[PDB]
Amino acid sequence: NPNYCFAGKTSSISDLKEVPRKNITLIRGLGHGAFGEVYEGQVSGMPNDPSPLQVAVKTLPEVCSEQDELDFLMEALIISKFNHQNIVRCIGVSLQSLPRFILLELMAGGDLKSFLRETRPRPSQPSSLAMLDLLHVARDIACGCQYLEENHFIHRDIAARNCLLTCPGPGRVAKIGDFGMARDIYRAGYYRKGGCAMLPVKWMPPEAFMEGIFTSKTDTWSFGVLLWEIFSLGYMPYPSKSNQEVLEFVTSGGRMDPPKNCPGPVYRIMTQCWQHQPEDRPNFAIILERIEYCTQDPDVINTALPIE
Numbered sequence: 001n002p003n004y005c006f007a008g009k010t011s012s013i014s015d016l017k018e019v020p021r022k023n024i025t026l027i028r029g030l031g032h033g034a035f036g037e038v039y040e041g042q043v044s045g046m047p048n049d050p051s052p053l054q055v056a057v058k059t060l061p062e063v064c065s066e067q068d069e070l071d072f073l074m075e076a077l078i079i080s081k082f083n084h085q086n087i088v089r090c091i092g093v094s095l096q097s098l099p100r101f102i103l104l105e106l107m108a109g110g111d112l113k114s115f116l117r118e119t120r121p122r123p124s125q126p127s128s129l130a131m132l133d134l135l136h137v138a139r140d141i142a143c144g145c146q147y148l149e150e151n152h153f154i155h156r157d158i159a160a161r162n163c164l165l166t167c168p169g170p171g172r173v174a175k176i177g178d179f180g181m182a183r184d185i186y187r188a189g190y191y192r193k194g195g196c197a198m199l200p201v202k203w204m205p206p207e208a209f210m211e212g213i214f215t216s217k218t219d220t221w222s223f224g225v226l227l228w229e230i231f232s233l234g235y236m237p238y239p240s241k242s243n244q245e246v247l248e249f250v251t252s253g254g255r256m257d258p259p260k261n262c263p264g265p266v267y268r269i270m271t272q273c274w275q276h277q278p279e280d281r282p283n284f285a286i287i288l289e290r291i292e293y294c295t296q297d298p299d300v301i302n303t304a305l306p307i308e
């Protein structure tokens with residue numbers, strides 16, 4: 001029964017909140033994925049009539065290995081032990097019925113990459129998205145990243161597809177919602193269930209793909225790329241290049257151009273996140289204060305977003 005250790009007390013499955021299977025109702029499939037399903041559901045505590053708890057339910061496929069099972073359990077542990085408004089909450093688990101459930105904060109606005117793509121200013125459907133919407137999301141995630149850093153957790157896979165939004169409209173809050181990669185390295189010493197084609201090399205600094213060195217400065221680099229993803233409104237990093245081209249480009253000093261219409265101050269922040277020497281990269285407290293400076297500048301927040 002493997003333990004998990006964070007900040008830096010210890011826990012195990014025994015410390016997960018086991019919710020009675022009979023209390024959980026699945027409403028709809030929310031996409032899914034290749035390994036496991038995600039549903040919108042309800043937990044009817046205690047059971048009642050209502051107001052029940054709205055949740056996202058992650059399933060473990062019932063045909064899986066012992067290692068898969070431990071991996072699923074580990075994800076539960078990692079997530080439950082966080083306490084940050086910019087990190088998705090784990091509501092509990094349902095491990096004593098099959099298939100196994102993890103129950104997470106329902107994030108109604110979906111993943112960040114998809115949200116951006118789906119809400120890009122278009123006309124027909126008008127411009128209900130502006131520069132400050134983008135800056136707030138960047139601050140939200142910076143805030144969560146800072147909490148990981150201060151508690152010495154390396155995420156390893158910061159990326160818009162791994163961030164989620166509480167809702168689509170104004171008032172949305174962006175949160176980090178995926179810890180699969182962190183879990184994997186925690187479990188073996190390395191990327192055992194992956195391989196090279198599965199690495200997020202486009203979000204990795206040179207010391208990371210070259211040496212397998214990860215520190216909180218490697219998340220900083222990843223964050224820079226996230227920013228570009230946000231300010232490009234959900235484009236793939238290094239638009240024309242493959243993984244290898246990117247690894248060659250970045251190694252030789254190459255860096256992405258600013259996204260269309262990106263204010264200089266925001267771009268400056270990305271370029272500092274991508275300094276070659278990790279020691280030259282800002283930590284998350286500096287990144288936050290910088291994104292707040294951008295927030296205060298009318299010339300940045302008054303800038304129009306492109307219309308594709």
Ligand SMILES: Nc1ncnc2c1ncn2[C@@H]1O[C@H](COP(=O)(O)OP(=O)(O)O)[C@@H](O)[C@H]1O
Nearest residue numbers: 030031032033038056104105106107111161178
């Ligand atoms: N807490 C949540 N609320 C709403 N949607 C979610 C939540 N967690 C994941 N999803 C979405 O459900 C789908 C499947 O998730 P999954 O395949 O496990 O991907 P990931 O590894 O990025 O979490 C994706 O579209 C994902 O963004």
